[PDB]
Design a protein around this nucleic acid. Sequence first.
DNA 1: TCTCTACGGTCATCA
DNA 2: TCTCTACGGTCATCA
Lengths: 114, 115
Amino acid sequence: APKCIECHINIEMDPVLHDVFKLQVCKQCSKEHPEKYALLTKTECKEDYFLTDPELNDEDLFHRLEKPNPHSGTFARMQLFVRCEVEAFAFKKWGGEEGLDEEWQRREEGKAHR
Amino acid sequence: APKCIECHINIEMDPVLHDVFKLQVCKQCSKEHPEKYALLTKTECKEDYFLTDPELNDEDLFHRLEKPNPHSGTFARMQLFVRCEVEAFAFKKWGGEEGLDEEWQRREEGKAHRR
DNA sequence: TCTCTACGGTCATCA
DNA sequence: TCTCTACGGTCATCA
Ligand SMILES: [Zn+2]
Ligand SMILES: [Zn+2]
């Protein structure tokens, strides 16, 4: 009977992280580690990791969870990604947390100047 | 039988202009009047009239003719539009031939000022 | 917890 | 008679 990979104790996994993101991880351990397991909207991914629509729209590249748009159900569906997947890609894209910090610095100086 | 609308003589219409563009016009008159009947690629429409993909991709807004891409058949299909349709829209978009000329002037001073 | 495309302008590859 | 979207940024809509 397989144990949550963080706590090594629990056997009931979080249904979304298990089912959608293929992570053997319990709900509690997920709350106790947002550095890995927090879900981000598509807008957060663009803003916080400078990903783009081509990347995030790629189903072979990220798992995602769709929900109704909380602003109005007649709006485009919300999409949530799991931080570790995202943050792995961003780092590979930009060269670790350092390289990403630089990109953040770069676009920052861009708009100050504009 | 219905006669061409340019010459009023011929009864055989140009098959593409008739069939695709819904114009009762014959091959000869289409050659004698490119100001209306010449076909333009999608790239020509963008360059010469500052139309955009959303506009040109709209089937309700323009008729179009698709052919194999003459550069390579594995490339995206060529699309051709008829000048009068295009030039009507551009004029409505930019405010006659005058307003379009200005837009042409506008983007050209843009490129100069990008040294 | 929001999202998508529209707008400049353009090189590349199918490219 | 070449076409597409990829990139930087951002606002309006549904929007
Ligand atoms: Zn656990
Ligand atoms: Zn005729």
